[PDB]
Amino acid sequence: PPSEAQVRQAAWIARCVGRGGSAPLHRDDVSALAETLQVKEFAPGAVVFHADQTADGVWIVRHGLIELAVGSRRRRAVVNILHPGDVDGDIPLLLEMPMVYTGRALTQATCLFLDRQAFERLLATHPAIARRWLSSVAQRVSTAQIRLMGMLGRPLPAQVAQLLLDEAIDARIELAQRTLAAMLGAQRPSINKILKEFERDRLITVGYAVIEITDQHGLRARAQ
Ligand SMILES: [Cl-]
Structure with a gap:
């Protein structure tokens, strides 16, 4: 089974997922990017991305729920659930870090996929998208940091x-x-x-x- 530390670590890393106002791409931009974003469909239980593997790019949930978990399938601990609109993969990519949890479709799901080459090209050629991505990353990790800070010593x-x-x-x-x-x-x-x-x-x-x-x-x- 996953150790308490592995579960703790994965759960707090999963609190940096992009959501709502903090999502790195404006909804209008996700729409305009339809010929860059790949549409990927998942049956329940199907793996979207694996733990301990480098991010193939950035994932955006369009519908359904993605469970984020650690541990072998049998002794699985679910640390978070991605809802429609949520974005993951980009912070690990920016840290040059592998994913530390596995994403599996809980329900039938559809995800948009921005491969790492396309991601790098996008940031290099569309400064407005890059600028928003910067504020998004700052907002997401700072919000997690504030939650942690507030609980210490309590x-x-x-x-x-x-x-x-x-x-x-x-x-x-x-x-x-x-x-x-x-x-x-x-x-x-x-x-x-x-x-x-x-x-x-x-x-x-x-x-x-x-x-x-x-x-x-x-x-x-x-x-x-
Ligand atoms: Cl899993």
């Missing part, structure tokens, strides 16, 4: 509160408790105890696979 319950608030999409968190624990350098039983307490105080609801935030203001106060 008691574990406050860290879990903050992590939940930051992870939430439409007030829902669908990550495993083992992964949440690894992100905080903690053990699953510790996270579970804190989640039970938050549940008793009516801050969250913990279903089978999902945590829902039921009182955001109350949870913010626990984050300190």
Whole structure:
């Protein structure tokens, strides 16, 4: 199974994925680039890109969900989920680093692919796209850095509160408790105890696979 450190590392690297306002390409530009971007379709379970391999280029999700995970297929830990509009591959390429997690289609999915040659050509010939990419990279890694900074030295319950608030999409968190624990350098039983307490105080609801935030203001106060 992947070590806690491998899971922690992959999960925080996966928090630098481009999304919404932070995405490196404007939607208008993704459209204009149709003859450069390759359309790639994935059945559920199919690999988009492998861990420990150099990025073949930049991936953009057009529809479906891509799971990001570490560990062998059997002992898999999911560290993040890419939604439509999300972009990955570009920061590792800029760091000259291999991917540290595997992306697998969760649902049927379609991804646009910008190969590394096309990427280099694009930045070299379209200064406006390059300039936006620069602000995007800065925004994405700085946002991750700010989340980490804010949790240092804080008691574990406050860290879990903050992590939940930051992870939430439409007030829902669908990550495993083992992964949440690894992100905080903690053990699953510790996270579970804190989640039970938050549940008793009516801050969250913990279903089978999902945590829902039921009182955001109350949870913010626990984050300190
Ligand atoms: Cl996998």
